[model samples]
Target: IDYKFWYTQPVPKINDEFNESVNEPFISDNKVEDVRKDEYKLPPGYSWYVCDVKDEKDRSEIYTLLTDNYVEDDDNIFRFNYSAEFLLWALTSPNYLKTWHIGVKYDASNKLIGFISAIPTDICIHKRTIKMAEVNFLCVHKTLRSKRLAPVLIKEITRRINLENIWQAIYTAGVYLPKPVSDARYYHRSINVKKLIEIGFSSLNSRLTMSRAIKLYRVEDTLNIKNMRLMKKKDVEGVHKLLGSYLEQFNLYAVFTKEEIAHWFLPIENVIYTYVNEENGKIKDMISFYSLPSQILGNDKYSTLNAAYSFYNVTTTATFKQLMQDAILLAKRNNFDVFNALEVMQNKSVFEDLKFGEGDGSLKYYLYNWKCASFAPAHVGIVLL
Candidate 1:
């Protein structure tokens, strides 16, 4: 759990004041001025600024903005934001959140306007050696869209990664912009077909249903009285077994053991877990959650106990509904305003039907080698920076 490389190094500091009076990147031999770690400084009217979110206040604001814009419709609902403490733990923890975020502030008033972030992660591709940073949560305020702030943010962020010697960056976006510096596409499966149809997933005439005949399940609250708690150490094995059974279904799956499941899902710090007991009181289903408490971001008074991010909810049909119900109840008990489920299968319309606000949801995977990326575009997908 200890990442000496990350903890020992210091994140470079930049001034909030933009007096450079420069706009496009310039070629230079000096490493500091390398394409990475530099932002395009536009004129006063078109000012573009970037910064690393260091304190709890900045972290909470950035999270709120991104969570609010991330859409969760009938087909895709379920995503959460990490709390201030969670963000701190992720950055300071040995595990890499590797979240290098860049934001654009209005030159006139120094207001935080637009933002984008990427996390560095080690991924294996076709047994090749490489490092990748997954770019995520790119957003711009509606009022600032005309300024074309996205391209500016992208150039600056990528330059930073390139300077770090990172080989590639992978991200998914509906719009076309970046040239992918490499990209790939994957098949998305949904649990709720009817809901997917309602949300435009069927417009392409590509719909498939599972032959297994899915069933809806829920937790039996009556079992949780005194000695019957939600989740416990004993429940880890069952959860692992439940998740392991689904490995054959997907082409790509991360193998996890009982201990990994417990630690990954229920990080002892700011996360909570729940479970359902069977006939003889054995843990049958598990639901986990993390709290993203509220804070002030600029002048906006905002607070969201976002439920989407982090590896939170997982269960089998034998107890899917049970897990869902328990997750909702636990979220409410902890004063979480919304259950922002992330990248949930499109068929599971449970959340949207329950009236959760819908937004955009997607994740992009790309190949490292040129041949792998060349074949990616042939599949009718465009790379979004």
Candidate 2:
């Protein structure tokens, strides 16, 4: 009974210099052979390609693989938009791009078979450390799921992390089957829980189930035009100040400074859209998103638009509704089929009002060796119980 194998191994050292190297060791060496596990064969004549997506051609393939497996109509919440420049950032950004990535390749017939990525990040985890990797976009071609390719991809990634001597990785997933795992549950607060239940967003409790009807508004109905706009370089200082106040309400916080903000939020190559409500021209409430055009089913160039990942959505209650409504509208206007709002429990009420339903819970944050991860008694303004 070797149950220990089911658990994550001890956290490994993270090497920053190796992580930041433009030429990732695995991808540069064309080293799939070394990294591949014998748990399954590549099907005769088939080969594994660990692409780093540094060019236009590579970016297209990565997008296709992601659009096919990770972003279906029903499960559209985790989509990401990757571009050539973004890829460059993933390889070059000093703060985050160091380990953030998209890797994919085809089989013998040049058919796309497997894919996964890990985004390195420095977050202010409440009272915890300021930097860590947020491993995201873990997807495998459906036919290959039985082979456990994911863990293999993950191992290669960790191997890279080990080489870089980096310490932690953070991500949210539905299943619990890996080392270095912890409980960082996704939190959802509804502006109207009753409405959520009516929309079938919430499951009924068996012991005290109630059959009540609730009225709801379509997410498109509300609009606050002035505040929501594409994020700009000049706004970084103001946005950081605003986010600082917002962090105080959360029980746990991941402190990201202004310089980190520029790297994460205001990357010159990335398309970050910000929407804010202003009173007398002063920014009151703000929400930001990053998205890019995507191709699906092999030729539909405008088939979809994916929101890269959302961070720093904060504002007062009076302005939250408008900020969210406008943001969703902006997404739809861009012809984006889906919006990926990660860890959005911070503003549950607005999401509820916008009719945004919860998808599968993603990353669960856990403290390995409790002392290494910070913890403190603090006020979390909202909780989704």
Candidate 3:
């Protein structure tokens, strides 16, 4: 953990603490010419490649790099795999920059070897809302770990973002870095218990049989939340108002405009699913989940494990637990095998009653080139993809 690179970076170390209140970037603002204009040099046999995520061929190359070498279980039970369509939606936000979707390719053959990306966003801490680059999807090939590509990839993206005058960034990682603002545990509720056991995602104990486990996680065919329905175009204005006011309570949370909300919250088939609790044409609450499947390795019967991740939600009319139960019921109806949520926000309140087991891993949230007091997990309210 004694890496010298972070020591020179703008993030705070263990000794950083401040009183009073200030929210300026670590580095002073500079002219565009002061930022690095040239791309960082690759180790060898590699060249910088800017990806246009909208192009199918360009998107497919990056997809292959992530699918085969992306995050996976240490024991090789399951691997996170993103669909081409999903990648298209993820990297291509509204008015997105093509250059921020950075990739590295072999100069001779044009094969992509590495990738990292950033999207425009703003986050509020206390009362200061600072525009930031939401960095994500950092991955390198399996055989290239020791080649020092990760650091260079990080540096390259930092340069690209600085050119746009963004001084801070936000990202989450499973591995710990110099320091984290908040740490959140992972919890998953079983929707298809039988297939999950077959894939080694879950197991049956001697005290409990398969039938009992199935009944334990069983969801109702029809939920009692009659007011909840699929989010529609007409509900946009209402959703914006209700969700905006709810986000104000968090110590640190992402800020999305109505345009970004439409891009993120509105449901797209097989990619995003958003529902709202509407009563008399007024939006009271909302819940949304997105599709992210994983490859079922070494399993002959199963090729994929369809998973749904909790995106964002706000509940006022019903208890947060009751609203999440409806989310699980809807996920089961949509053929999702499991539902995943982090301990941040009001998620911990519903994990036990919904039969979600705690995962061995935890996600660490970090802020780049920013200074703020670290707060509790429940005080955090952002999800980075």
Candidate 4:
């Protein structure tokens, strides 16, 4: 696929050959002053606004825009419904920039119609750390699809991040963009088999009846791990070290600070959940997942699919498979309809053993202004929400 606007940007072209030694920015000539002094021109009836995620009004407007227009399944049967609390938590991480929350508004009605945001992070690629932006939540109102506003939104966010002197970014998309550094397939474990079948999210195999299928996917209500408890503020330092060491095996991963660890891993109602195994005042293992419910379209009996996405985990005293099984039990105990993960890092080791079926969709990871050799799914350790 020829990405018209992507071809003109700093990302690797579709036809570019893989080069292991090339790790610098594709275009490094521009300085902060050289970036566009004004905002990228929007259509006559649209205007740009710097979204203040902390403001309740601005946050609600963005929530409405994304909830009605963001990512949907291939069959349009379900759409991601990001809550206001999730957005606030995601966008306001440590060292977040308010200017990166770019928004587009209808001129006459003053309604928010489009958005793209970036948050600061340091990702280690091939053992080299680089400061970069993690761009996410790009959306445009459904009515304005024909206006080609998505490209404009991308450019505006790029300009804002550039002004801050960050030249590289990482993002994932379901559709193919210019090139992908790594592609990971989605895996799903049914927590509520009956509800999933009714909502058309899953189907029973020909060899098995509905009752048998439900029985096969059943999980234990009691957790098996010893000394496992909810992560607290005091455990941040220990978790930082454990996660940092575990992620070093991957070709690409995020390097997190203690503050970042606390912000992302601490338990938040309906947002994030993290647990650790503390034995004799030493943390040996950690597990976490985030809540991202999807709106079930036009289902008479069900309106939502409560999903738990595997975020980050590390194990020292226990096997990875055992840790994931406990995660499944934790999710099932919390009323999650399904547990989802990507085949990245060490997750592939447990998928088949844990009975997580392969999903039809795949997510492609891309870099904006950096390039490196391609990686297998296991070599990629980063997970974007």
Model with the higher lDDT, candidate 1 or 2: 2
Give a tens-digit lDDT track for model 4, residues 1-385: 5578888998788878777887777877769888888888987888889899999999999999988999999899999998999999999999999999999899899999899999999999888898999999999899888577889999889888989988889999998888899999999999999998889988987798899998999876666686778999989989998998889889889999999999999999899989999987778999899999999989888888999999998889889999999999888877899999999989999999999999997999998888788889999989999
What tens-digit string does per-residue lDDT give for candidate 3 at 243-310?
Answer: 88888888788787888888888888778889998887789989899999999888889999999999
Query: What TM-score does prediction 4 earn?
Result: 0.98
* lDDT of all predictions: 0.44, 0.49, 0.87, 0.90
Top candidate by TM-score: 4
Runs off by more than 4 Å, candidate 1: 1-38, 41-54, 60-99, 124-130, 172-219, 223-249, 253-264, 267-286, 289-385
Better of 1 and 4 by TM-score: 4
TM-score, ranked from best to worst = 4, 3, 2, 1
What lDDT is reached at residue 50 by model 4? 85
User: By the lDDT metric, which is better: model 1 or model 3?
Assistant: 3
* lDDT score, candidate 3: 0.87
Per-residue alpha-carbon lDDT of candidate 2 for residues 153-269, written as tens digits (9 for 90 to 100): 666566665445454555544554332122333333233334334434355565534543223322444455644555666766776777767776554455657875566566343
In angstroms, the error of model 4 at 67 is 1.1
Model 3 weakest lDDT span, ten residues long:
16-25
Could you tell me every candidate's TM-score relative to the true structure? 0.49, 0.61, 0.97, 0.98
Candidate 3 residue spans exceeding 4 A from truth: 15-22
